[PDB]
A paper describes a structure:
Like other negative-strand RNA viruses (NSVs) such as influenza and rabies, vesicular stomatitis virus (VSV) has a three-layered organization: a layer of matrix protein (M) resides between the glycoprotein (G)-studded membrane envelope and the nucleocapsid, which is composed of the nucleocapsid protein (N) and the encapsidated genomic RNA. Here, by cryoEM and sub-particle reconstruction, we have determined the in situ structures of M and N inside VSV at 3.47 Å resolution. A double layer of M contributes to packaging of the helical nucleocapsid: the inner M (IM) joins neighboring turns of the N helix, while the outer M (OM) contacts G and the membrane envelope. N-RNA, N-N, and N-M-M interactions govern the formation of the capsid.
We were able to fit an atomic model of 19 protein subunits, comprising 7 N and 12 M, and two long segments of single stranded RNA (33 and 35 nucleotides in length, respectively) into our density map obtained by sub-particle reconstruction. The atomic model contains 19 subunits arranged across three radial layers from inner to outer: N layer, inner M (IM) layer, and outer M (OM) layer in one intact and two partial helical turns of the asymmetric units along the helical axis. Based on the extent of interactions between subunits, we defined an asymmetric unit to contain an N subunit and two M subunits. In addition to the close lateral interactions between two adjacent N subunits in the same turn, the single-stranded RNA threads through the cleft of N subunits. Each N subunit accommodates 9 nucleotides of RNA. When the in situ and crystal structures of single N subunit are compared, the main body and RNA-binding pattern remain the same between two structures, but there are significant differences in the N-terminal arm (Ser2 – Val25, termed N-arm) and an extended loop (Leu344 – Tyr355, termed C-loop). Compared to those in the crystal structure (blue), in in situ N (red), the N-arm rotates downwards (towards the base) by 30 degrees, and the C-loop rotates outwards (towards the outside of the capsid) by 13 degrees. Adjusting the conformation of the N-arm and C-loop allows N to adopt to different subunit numbers per turn with different diameters. In the in situ structure, the N-arm and C-loop pivot outwards, which makes the ring larger to accommodate more subunits per turn. The IM layer bridges between the N layer and the OM layer; there is no direct contact between N and OM. Despite its location between two successive turns of N subunits, the IM subunit interacts significantly only with two N subunits in the same turn, not the N in any other turns (rows in orange). The main vertical interactions are between the N-terminal segment (Leu41 – Met48) of IMU and the main body of IML, and those interactions determine the distance between successive turns.
Numbering used by the authors:
A (entry chain P): 50 to 162, 169 to 229
B (entry chain U): 56 to 122, 127 to 194, 201 to 212, 220 to 229
C (entry chain O), E (entry chain N): 41 to 229
D (entry chain T): 51 to 122, 127 to 229
F (entry chain R): 64 to 122, 127 to 137, 152 to 178, 192 to 195, 200 to 211, 224 to 229
G (entry chain L): 61 to 143, 148 to 212, 217 to 225
H (entry chain C): 54 to 342, 373 to 422
I (entry chain B): 160 to 317
Amino acid sequence: DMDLYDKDSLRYEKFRFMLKMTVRSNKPFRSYDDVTAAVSQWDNSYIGMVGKRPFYKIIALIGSSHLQATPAVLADLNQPEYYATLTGRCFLPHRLGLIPPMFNVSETFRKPFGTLDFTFTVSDDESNEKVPHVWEYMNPKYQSQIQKEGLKFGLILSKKATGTWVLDQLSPFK
Amino acid sequence: KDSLRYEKFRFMLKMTVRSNKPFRSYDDVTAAVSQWDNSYIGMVGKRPFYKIIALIGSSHLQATPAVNQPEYYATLTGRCFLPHRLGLIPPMFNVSETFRKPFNIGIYKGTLDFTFTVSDDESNEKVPHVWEYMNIQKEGLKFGLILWVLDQLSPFK
Amino acid sequence: LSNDFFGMEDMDLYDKDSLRYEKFRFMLKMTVRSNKPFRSYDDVTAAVSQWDNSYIGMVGKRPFYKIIALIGSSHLQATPAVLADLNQPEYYATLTGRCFLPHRLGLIPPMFNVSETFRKPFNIGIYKGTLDFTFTVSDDESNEKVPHVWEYMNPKYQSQIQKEGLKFGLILSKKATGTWVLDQLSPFK
Amino acid sequence: MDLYDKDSLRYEKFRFMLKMTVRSNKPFRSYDDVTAAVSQWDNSYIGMVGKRPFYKIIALIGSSHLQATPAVNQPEYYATLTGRCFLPHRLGLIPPMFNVSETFRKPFNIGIYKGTLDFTFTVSDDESNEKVPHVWEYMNPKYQSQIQKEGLKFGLILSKKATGTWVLDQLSPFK
Amino acid sequence: LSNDFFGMEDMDLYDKDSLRYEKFRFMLKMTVRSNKPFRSYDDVTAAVSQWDNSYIGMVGKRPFYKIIALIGSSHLQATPAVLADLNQPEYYATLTGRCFLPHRLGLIPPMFNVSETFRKPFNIGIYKGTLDFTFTVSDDESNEKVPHVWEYMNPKYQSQIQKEGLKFGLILSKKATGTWVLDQLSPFK
Amino acid sequence: FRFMLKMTVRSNKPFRSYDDVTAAVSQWDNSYIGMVGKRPFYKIIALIGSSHLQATPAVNQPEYYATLTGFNVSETFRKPFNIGIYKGTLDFTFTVSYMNPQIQKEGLKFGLIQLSPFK
Amino acid sequence: YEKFRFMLKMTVRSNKPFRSYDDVTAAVSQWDNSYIGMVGKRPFYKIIALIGSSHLQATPAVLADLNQPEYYATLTGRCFLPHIPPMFNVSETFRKPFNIGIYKGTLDFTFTVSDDESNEKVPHVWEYMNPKYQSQIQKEGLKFGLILTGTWVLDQL
Amino acid sequence: YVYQGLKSGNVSIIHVNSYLYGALKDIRGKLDKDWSSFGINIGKAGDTIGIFDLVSLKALDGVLPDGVSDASRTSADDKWLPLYLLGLYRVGRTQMPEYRKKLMDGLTNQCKMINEQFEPLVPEGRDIFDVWGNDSNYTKIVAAVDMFFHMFKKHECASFRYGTIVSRFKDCAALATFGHLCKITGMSTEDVTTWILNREVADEMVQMMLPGQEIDKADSYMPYLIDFGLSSKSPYSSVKNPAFHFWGQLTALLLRSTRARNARQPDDIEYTSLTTAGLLYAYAVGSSARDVVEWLGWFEDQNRKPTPDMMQYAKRAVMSLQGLREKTIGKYAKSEFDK
Amino acid sequence: LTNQCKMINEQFEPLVPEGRDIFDVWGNDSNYTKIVAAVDMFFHMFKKHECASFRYGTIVSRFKDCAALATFGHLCKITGMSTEDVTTWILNREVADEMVQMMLPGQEIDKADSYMPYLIDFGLSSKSPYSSVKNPAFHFWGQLTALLLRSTRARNAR
């Protein structure tokens, strides 16, 4: 191994984010696990930038977390269409090594699992102002065991015993 | 690497809970306060100490004599040490950080207000214990604390 | 910091936090709208403090702009529209004068008599609305004494200023004399 | 922190003078309303900063000695006092003081009561070596919870050193 | 002062406050408008003391302008409009003559026979309104003896000129003979 | 040898302990211009002066002060010190032509033992 | 005692900010790996490099994450070195990359070592290093290759 | 600071200079040959060199203005912002609406090649970048950038040469027209210098051709003698050398050169003798595909009066010049040589 | 001047009223002339100074009351003839005397960064020997000669 970052040199990467969410299904999703299963197959065929893949996965997870239903999701009105939108700034502790620089470029994702609709704006930030922890954007209302909830999106997490999860790596060569 | 650390700290506190209707059980209070750090701006090093301070404040919540809308209140100033399995932590400074995140746990909805001044103290005198300030393992558990000696933190878990 | 890496000795003019007094004459305009009237001034501080979410304005006046926003929130008198059921409650406040602020932020670059507006929507949960600011902070090379800036807040509001000023992001400390000194802003903000 | 009395107790002797003047729409009922009306005397303090705590304590002595004029149109109060004393304070070193008089006036609106004030402060230092009476002896308080409560809200801070002399710790306005 | 830095020795012409008499003739016009009549002369001094909040006028006559403002406020006789309910109470006062003012403000620059008007609204709380002024302060080289300046105030008003004359920013003292000498203006003003 | 000494130390704030005093005074010879042979003598005289530092009764900035008298050329010295918290200037009086001690550490930190400056 | 006046400009760039003084010496001692300047003043060049490393003040870019930390140091003065061909007032630059493992980057020098026939008294050269740095004088001197009454004397390289 | 100053059109020169230094520390670019100039060891055949490595750097002594910093700008500055800041110097050096508009279009095209969004920053009105040329440090920075990218032509950031190319050979029109005369005739530079006459062109040549100036070295400090502050009054300018500039421009015009029709006529200099010498040289070149004394004797055979054949040749060389701009050599020749 | 001032502060409301000028008397005062000429000298030595815009207004003090040297240089630079041989061409025996009185050696008239151009603003010379009223013959002769050679400058000198 090299001497700069031997194997898993932990680093913090501040970055802004933006997200648009739209999930359709024959029937409304009952539990969070069904939503994650219906969302996790968004990157079946991946075309966008590779350097933002882990961050795209985490933003997809947080969008799955905040899937506020629409009035059409009621008993029997129409096809249940979900929606979510999360904006702000955050830093992700990860051990994936140095990541290539990121630019402000929106990236849509339209893959069926119903269908999906994404708009990521994961870009760099050079400001010194402190930003909230990215794993902390997920409210404790959902994700009873957030390790499994965030792990079946392709991620693998590990508690640091301090309360801030660190991203170890994604699924093999994803 | 991951052993117990008897760490000294002097802090400050005043809890402030507002809601639509008065809190019936302590569990609802815990659910209302557990979402105080939905967007954490303050230093990460003081986060476990901040949750300890949230525990001490929520345990001593006394409603104001006025109780318009129900407004709870607390205040604690003291000096103590916390034993933890958290490893090395950066030394603290004498800075105050406020907080606020609205909560929606169903029946109960409202805002919060903090003023935390957890700072290091190098005095060699023996000072009281943090868990003696109480009047517990389950209260820590639904605040994300793991247990008295602290083990680790489990937010949104 | 110095404990981590090599060779970061501090400056010689101001050692670390050389306290200095900077007289400056100011001006202010305030306009706060919301879906519902603010029950307490504390919620007013919560709603106004999000004015600098995206900061485009001046730099040598950012702490000064924060203190002027604090004084504007303190004097947010209501309007007849704030009555029972007319429209969205639109608050208003205007303050003008001269003052000197003790701070330990180091020498500030010279400011000029320029006015810039600020507009930013906020969401503190229950309440919504927008904002409208107008600052005119600039130096004053005169010699006449000026009222201390923290005195511009009446004692009727701000039962405890040490955190009402912290809600806006400021860090305050007590000089043990009765005059507050500004330590710094919110961490690296 | 300094070795040589950074923030320790200090004894400052001074010869001062006072002339009070309070007016209001209707006469004050309780002493607390008087305190609320007088406490807003320095909303815009223009005078010397170093004499602010001494100005506050002279405001204390003036409010404690407010006797209504025989006229009590609008009820106007009045008081005056001149004396010599020394103040025990814990505010550190203070700049030297001169024999200069400074006026004060700030209208108050505490709700029920509205009016203006008028102050006359000539609090100056002097180097006479003779023993002088205690400053707090000018009071006529209840030592239990009277001088400690009204002074606290006037923004002053009091405490006990078990000696029996009231000591000044901090000045806390709009707090 | 000398206790602070190095080398601020005073001049040999006037040691610190060498007393000198400045004979000068003058003229004065005044017009004070207000929402309500002034109940007491103290309120009059409060309303007139801020006549120079934003000062554009003379420097060598600024203490003289302050004393002329004081003498005008002393003789501010009412008008028929001040009666029960006709309109806003409008006050008026004019004084002309010659006088000498003992003062310790150092040598004054040579004054000229030029008039300057002054206009400024006042806000002393309960009372609203504006002011008006016309000074004609200038030197008088004639040997003609002049009445003492502080004598121009009638003893009917100003029960304590030590403060009624101080309301405008002046600092007074007594020459141990019954003549008031002007020490200086408000400090740093 | 007989000598004469006049200590003069200034700082932004008065020193906490003797360690701060010796750390401040040890930077007096960053650029030594005087006689090299008298350098150990200069160090020991500076040490005896630092031992007897008694601040003026007025203790503006705190001005430390001390005096002691116990080729015959007098050479002055002045070098500012920056040990972090404590910062100021110095002024010596050396005419090399007494302790109340503890000494083995404070004196050694002056560079004494042989002489070991800037060790 | 070889009296001589001098001048110095220094610039060190690293991928990561330096651990301590020893790492600085390691990253700087490779400055004369390929020596091209005036061979006569090589010991004086080494001592000037030592003083430059001792006075390597940082820059704002050395902070958390702005760019590669670019250290800078300039020193001008006059001294005598107890320990040469007659040197002249000529300036030469040096540019050499260093590879000390954890650190990477290059350097930049401007040496102006020359004679000074003026009899004006000169401060001792080894006094130019502040006592704050270099806990072990001999070790840091040996790192640059230098070999060392209270006044240090240069043995050889 | 610089971004919001450009957007608001109230930027400070100190801030833009500081940002230009901060964003142009590209130590990359490996030399291959020694770059010594004026006795200065800039580099030695294989050492990495930066833009500011070739100029001494000091700390400015003054008060820093406030600044209007925007904290939401990513690290996409070095790609296009220094290029724009350097181009607004050449854009502001025009002082004519049409040329300024064309240069602004070219600069926008150059910048949009990199970032592809580039909303224009400086407001359309109240151009503030004209003052930037007055400052000395900005000119030093722009000239250093120009010379560094002139040595390293194949650099990745070589696009910065736009806007700073005007700094090359700034206020050196006399040497430029000497080179133009030497090139447009094919005659050797050692032989053309004998042909100059009128004894004022001789003095201007003497003051131009000081041996210790190394004016024939491309990678030297000479072309930036006034931007680097080397000389406050350039001896190679067209105002300090008006006679030779006029004579060379006229001679090149009479030899059918497209360049010598826009250079402006120098003011208050004797023209008749210069025009006669230029006509003699032009006729010698255009009718004899060149010795100077032979033509001087031939002209003396006419006791120093142009022949009608030479006037006909000048008429041919100056006729059919459409769109001649005023006060230039073309207009003067069309007025006088096209009777 | 207004355009130059707006280039810096960009408000620049005009100060002096349009009528009843008072700034003509400023030239009479010696100290104002000394200050303005010193400013012109300083900013002439340092062309590229950040405050070089002050050269406006003070440029009039440069070579003030020295029209004879102005027209001599204009003549020597309009004919191309050397200043060494133009003086051989002056005639009438009073132009020769004026040339003699202008060409005293120890005056430093060929040095740009010297005190000569402000000989009357600094008060160095109450009566300038190099003026056009003390040297009217040379001014007239050289000015007419420059006019006869079709020079734009030589059309407005009285």
